Amino acid sequence: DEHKAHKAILAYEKGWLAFSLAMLFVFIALIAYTLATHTAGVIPAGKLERVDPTTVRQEGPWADPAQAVVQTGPNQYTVYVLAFAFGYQPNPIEVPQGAEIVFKITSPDVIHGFHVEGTNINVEVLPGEVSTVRYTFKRPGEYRIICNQYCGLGHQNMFGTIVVKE
Amino acid sequence: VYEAYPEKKATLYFLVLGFLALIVGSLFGPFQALNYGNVDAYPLLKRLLPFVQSYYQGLTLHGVLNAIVFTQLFAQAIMVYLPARELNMRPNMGLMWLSWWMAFIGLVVAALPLLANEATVLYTFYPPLKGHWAFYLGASVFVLSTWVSIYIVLDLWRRWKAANPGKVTPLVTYMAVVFWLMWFLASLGLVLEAVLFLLPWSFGLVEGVDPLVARTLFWWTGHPIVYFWLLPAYAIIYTILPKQAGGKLVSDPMARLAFLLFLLLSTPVGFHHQFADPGIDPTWKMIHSVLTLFVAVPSLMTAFTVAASLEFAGRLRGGRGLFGWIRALPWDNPAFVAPVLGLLGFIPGGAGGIVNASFTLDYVVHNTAWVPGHFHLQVASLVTLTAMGSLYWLLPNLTGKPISDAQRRLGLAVVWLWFLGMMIMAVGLHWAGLLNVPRRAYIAQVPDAYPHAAVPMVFNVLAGIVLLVALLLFIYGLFSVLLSRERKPELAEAPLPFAEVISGPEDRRLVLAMDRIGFWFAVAAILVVLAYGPTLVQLFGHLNPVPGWRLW
Amino acid sequence: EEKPKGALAVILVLTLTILVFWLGVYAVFFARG
Ligand code: HAS
Ligand code: HEM
Ligand code: CUA
Ligand SMILES: [Cu+]
């Protein structure tokens, strides 16, 4: 008693640790798995891509809303999105489904969230940096974009729309 | 009581200041819970509190007061006082009162801008959102207060090592030491952010700040800071709870190992808060993901060590079968209850965290109402409750004021309510999160935005009312305890209810290794440079400062 | 006395919850893929 409870307690403790490390390594494996699949596109690009947030909507690929989408491969379209204080340009965003859309998103003011409801596109958008994410839409219809990073009084009302043509 | 234990006073002043903060912050809680239940209660609050300007001014105040002011002041209380009484040594009093004044001067200075709607930027304060200088200077001085606290404890520890040459650091002190060292390393992120960017910016020395480096440096501190909130509660759970339960801490070495591992892995994991950030390598994120998974381990041990100790306790109290030991615990004692329930909610809390920390899985819930669901089970539940229950032994010990049967049952209501509410809220927030409902959002001002969350919006309403009532009862009781002129001096000079430790033969060699703190602190410091070094070097090379904005 | 059946009980609940959560969201991740 007490001392007999010590050893047993310490024994099952070692077993518990062995098991807990093993379960965590299983998790580590299943994540690595997704890192090898298509679904891994949603991870923002690692390389820094610096822009001017004060000159963003006056020159360059974000200046004209009409030029926002660009066919850049046989089934690849790059969309230049701009999330700004309380909205998203272009609105709505139009893209074909079964095509790989490569978003390149920035802001001219402060930090925004870009969260496409129903997908894995959830990225932070930084003033003076480009958030590059890759995704394929498999279902067509109107996907709603939400700002999920506090950006000011009008943050709760900052919504956008992605249009993926069947 | 104060002249030979003057540490007793200073410790009370931290705790009082800390419980005021907690109250003022918590007021906004109910309203936010209602807001997430699609009910707009703010014109009512704005009537009551005419200074409040926005939902977001409220949210700033709720974060800062609770998760920053309350939690720090409670750690500065426990993680100085508990070692002091174990060692039976006096902390450098000159230094102790200096740290209190800093925390108080700092709190007032920052408050003035917060209350003046001059820095509605939330507790994260992400640039380019530009707050009033006195917010940043106030925060600084508030957080540097802990650098005095580090010193204080190291001083105590050195001095004890001198009078006991070659003896192993006692348990609590060991916890306190690795604690304050870990915080020291961890604080370096935020201090740099402040010193290099946020201070000169707010003062107007510069006109821009890079958001990417700013939030990187932020999170270097950002993650460990939550451990900084957790460990003072862990210290109480490991060394006082088992005595409140009627048993013993079943392993000294385990507790040491848990804490050591926190020292090691607390800081080098910040990228799990930046999974959705650009300009950071996906490999570095996978790495920080794995180390994050590892930082789970310490709490996994904690869970067994602690559940054993309470089973054992339950057993001595005449425990029954598989579940008998549960019923034989002192459920009439709020000091036992509060932290046990906290631990219950911590199970769903942890599972939440591990999910968040799985890299690619973060995209499902990042910035959604799930995240606030996660952390109210951690900080607002486990930490706060252990903090609340602990008044039942700590307040008397400090003041000599007893606790009547009424106040004991009052507490019991408060404790159960707070726990039920939080649980109810947790179901709400997680559910809403999976349903893509964002956080930091005044969503009751756009009622038609999220119809798909009909039913978990009910829970959020329900929590808000339950937790309102619990809050008012807390204030009523807490003040009933501090405002009574009942005093027994002899219970003020009653030793803390530290728990006995069970110890075996194998301990010696393992504990000995763990008492090589200087070596472990250098190991920990290296891990920090290995994880953050390569990336910080890369951002600092390519600084792209953008100008400030005020959007409130 | 003996085996910490109670503690083992607790860590089982903990483990199971973790799996509910982890596997649950791992599904939702692919569902939104
Ligand atoms: C004080 C509160 C804090 C704790 C503690 C905490 C725990 C974890 N978290 Fe977290 N967290 C994340 C990962 C983790 C992980 C892996 C853990 C782990 O430490 C959890 C370990 C816990 C366990 C492994 C469970 C142990 C269970 C125990 C010990 C209880 C057993 C009960 C017993 C024995 C009682 C039985 C008794 C009887 C009588 C039967 C991640 C991702 O990796 C995010 C990013 C989300 C995003 O995208 O923004 C995150 C988000 C947050 C935020 C949002 C920050 C913001 O505003 O931006 C806060 C404030 C926070 C606080 C805390 N968090 N966390
Ligand atoms: C009275 C009980 C409480 C209630 C009803 C409550 C409710 C809430 C709700 C619904 C949110 C989400 C607000 C949003 O995302 O816009 C929130 C945010 C938050 N709560 Fe609480 N809470 C309570 C207590 C606490 C406590 C005790 C703490 C810490 C000690 C705490 C820390 C936080 C933090 C850090 C945030 C995040 C603010 C931010 O995102 O910047 N809460 N609270
Ligand atoms: Cu943009 Cu919130
Ligand atoms: Cu974290």
Side-chain angles (χ1 to χ4, degrees), chain A residues 63-69 89-90:
Chain A
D64 194 42
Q67 277 314 166
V69 199
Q89 160 201 121

Side-chain angles (χ1 to χ4, degrees), chain A residues 2 16 50 122 124 144 153, chain B residues 210 248 276 300 366 449 551:
Chain A
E2 187 160 312
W16 173 227
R50 262 52 166 91
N122 200 341
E124 309 263 6
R144 180 224 249 171
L153 294 189
Chain B
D210 190 299
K248 300 181 202 203
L300 287 145
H366 180 64
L551 294 161

Side-chain angles (χ1 to χ4, degrees), chain B residues 74-97:
Chain B
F74 179 74
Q76 283 181 292
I78 295 330
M79 300 315 267
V80 181
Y81 187 70
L82 289 199
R85 291 324 307 130
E86 177 181 52
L87 299 190
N88 181 40
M89 282 192 89
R90 181 169 307 159
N92 195 311
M93 283 317 283
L95 285 171
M96 215 187 168
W97 281 113

Side-chain angles (χ1 to χ4, degrees), chain B residues 29 32 36 55 59 62 66-67 123 375-376 380 422 439-440:
Chain B
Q32 288 162 190
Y36 275 95
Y55 171 73
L59 201 48
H62 178 71
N66 283 171
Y123 87 131
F375 64 74
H376 280 86
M422 285 310 159
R439 74 139 142 183
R440 288 159 173 193

Side-chain angles (χ1 to χ4, degrees), chain B residues 219 222-223 226-227 269 272-273:
Chain B
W219 284 113
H223 179 79
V226 311
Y227 295 97
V269 305
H272 77 241
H273 293 292

Side-chain angles (χ1 to χ4, degrees), chain A residues 112 147 149 151 155 158:
Chain A
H112 298 279
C147 177
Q149 188 51 270
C151 41
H155 147 84
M158 182 172 174

Side-chain angles (χ1 to χ4, degrees), chain A residues 16-85:
Chain A
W16 173 227
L17 251 157
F19 182 76
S20 292
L21 245 76
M23 150 180 64
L24 258 33
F25 275 114
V26 166
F27 295 147
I28 306 168
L30 290 170
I31 297 162
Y33 173 71
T34 65
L35 251 70
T37 63
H38 65 286
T39 75
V42 301
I43 308 154
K47 208 180 200 194
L48 284 165
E49 202 183 352
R50 262 52 166 91
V51 305
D52 195 328
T54 72
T55 83
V56 77
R57 51 175 136 210
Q58 302 166 68
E59 58 171 351
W62 290 276
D64 194 42
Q67 277 314 166
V69 199
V70 42
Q71 179 160 303
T72 178
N75 211 180
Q76 189 195 50
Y77 299 89
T78 298
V79 178
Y80 293 85
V81 180
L82 179 88
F84 52 85

